[PDB]
């Protein structure tokens, strides 16, 4: 159906790792290729890869990284559209790119559209993070890395922990992941958008963070949101970050709130005189 014959994809430079390792490739233009560097996949890696392909074959949206095909012959591989640019994690914490509040709002709106689509197709991403958000031509948001994604059909199949909700981190029960865990990850990415930094910035260790978020003793410091961030956006992120799953909002109304707030456009933080 979407299988790509061996030999058609010219694989170029190794660019990094994913949930496999990612390279650049040429196939009717540019493509990205996530591939597994093993001679013989184990049944668990082969089932994981088949599940990821199954999920991606249901994703068809402008703000979702466009899946283009898969290959099995040399090694198992998922191939997507190529995105010139960097991840949103890179822009926020690796180059400190000065984004205007308008572009931050637009990035949040496009991410919300992507996760509205995903949840409307009963897909839970289970690893939504600023590193898995890519900017195409520094203009369009593309949600990527579906290696931990699934469809919700009443069965559970199974370092980046800042986006993990307390339930997920607590591990009280075997099936923590849900729409609300994704909503909390989204809350964390809005935290990143509106503060410019990661949450839990001052607690340095990585292991205690888990205990504190699971218990509820620690939550993101919403006082580090910058003053030009609309109040609605801070309210929405607070709603998406609430400690108990059942009080968090759903993505249709998260999207509706971002859409309504999209249109409101206060360019003026303070008053402003006539320019050139």
């Amino acid at each position: 159906d979407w299988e790509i014959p061996d030999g058609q994809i010219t694989v170029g430079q190794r660019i990094g790792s994913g949930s496999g390792t990612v390279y650049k490739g040429k196939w009717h233009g540019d493509v990205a290729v996530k591939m597994l560097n093993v001679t013989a996949p184990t049944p668990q890696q082969l089932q994981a890869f088949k599940n990821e392909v199954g999920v991606l074959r249901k994703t068809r949206h402008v703000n979702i990284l466009l899946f283009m095909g898969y290959s099995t012959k040399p090694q198992l591989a998922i191939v997507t559209q190529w995105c010139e640019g960097s991840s949103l994690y890179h822009h926020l914490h690796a180059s400190e790119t000065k984004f205007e509040m308008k572009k931050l709002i637009d990035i949040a709106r496009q991410t919300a559209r992507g996760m509205d689509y995903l949840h409307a197709k009963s897909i839970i991403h289970r690893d939504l993070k600023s590193n898995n958000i890519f900017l195409h031509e520094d203009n369009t948001v593309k949600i990527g890395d579906f290696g931990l994604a699934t469809v919700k059909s009443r069965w559970s199949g199974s370092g980046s922990i800042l986006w993990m909700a307390p339930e997920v981190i607590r591990m009280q029960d075997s099936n923590p992941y849900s729409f609300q865990s994704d909503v909390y990850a989204f809350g964390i990415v809005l935290y990143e958008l509106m503060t410019g930094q990661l949450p839990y910035s001052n607690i340095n260790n990585r292991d205690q963070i888990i205990e504190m978020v699971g218990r509820g003793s620690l939550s993101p410091d919403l006082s580090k949101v910058r003053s030009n961030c609309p109040k609605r956006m801070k309210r929405l992120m607070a709603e998406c970050l609430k400690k108990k799953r059942d009080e968090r909002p759903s993505f249709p109304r998260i999207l509706a709130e971002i859409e309504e707030l999209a249109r409101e456009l206060p360019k003026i933080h303070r008053s402003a005189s006539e320019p050139s």
Binding site: P266, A272, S273, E274
Partner: protein
């Protein structure tokens, strides 16, 4: 030390190199020549000195704010203050240059009303700028001279100019923020601003869209 055309060419070249101090020096020389400037020469002088002074206004605001957040540290606040007064001196010298050029060449040689309202507006704007950093004993005087020039231009503005005319739309914008910021008269500033915006909506093509957007942002934030 060269022809007016040579200075205008070096001014345009400094403009494209974003070296606003050189362009300002060129246009200052061009105005000390004594002849009336063209619309282009007027615009180059405006851009040059507005950028030169805007850099200093931005630095002053940043360093003043940082002055506020000195808590329990004499020497930190002392350093921030002395730096603020250094910036203050540069800001004043620049504004004094611009106001001397305005009073000795620009306004007297303005043939049409447009030129002289523009130069009186610039007169008010630079007094504005000086006002924002004014100490308090001379502050009153500077504010008085600001409003005198502003209003003097304002009187001629809606007497020969169409509501769509960008120069007055800007004169209105600067006079309204003058009332709101420099003084404390929200009622007057909002009254004037809404009056001008509604008169403009009633009756340059792209310039006025954005100046009405600046008016709508101003009133939106003041109310």
């Amino acid at each position: 030390s060269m022809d007016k055309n040579e200075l205008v060419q070096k001014a345009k070249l400094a403009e494209q190199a974003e070296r606003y101090d050189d362009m300002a020096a060129c246009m200052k020389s061009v105005t000390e020549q004594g002849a009336e400037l063209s619309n282009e020469e007027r615009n180059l002088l405006s851009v040059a000195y507005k950028n030169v002074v805007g850099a200093r206004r931005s630095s002053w605001r940043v360093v003043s704010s940082i002055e506020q957040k000195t808590e329990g540290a004499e020497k930190k606040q002392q350093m921030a203050r002395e730096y603020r007064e250094k910036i203050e001196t540069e800001l004043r010298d620049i504004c004094n240059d611009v106001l001397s050029l305005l009073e000795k060449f620009l306004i007297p040689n303005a043939s049409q009303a447009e030129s002289k309202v523009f130069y009186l507006k610039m007169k008010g704007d630079y007094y504005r700028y000086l006002a924002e950093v004014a100490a308090g004993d001379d502050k009153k005087g500077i504010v008085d001279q600001s409003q005198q020039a502003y209003q003097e231009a304002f009187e001629i503005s809606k007497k020969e100019m169409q509501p769509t005319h960008p120069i007055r739309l800007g004169l209105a914008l600067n006079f309204s923020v003058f009332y709101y910021e420099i003084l404390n008269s929200p009622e007057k500033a909002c009254s004037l601003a809404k009056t001008a915006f509604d008169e403009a909506i009633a009756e340059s093509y792209k310039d006025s869209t954005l100046i009405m957007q600046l008016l709508r942002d101003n009133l939106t934030l003041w109310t």
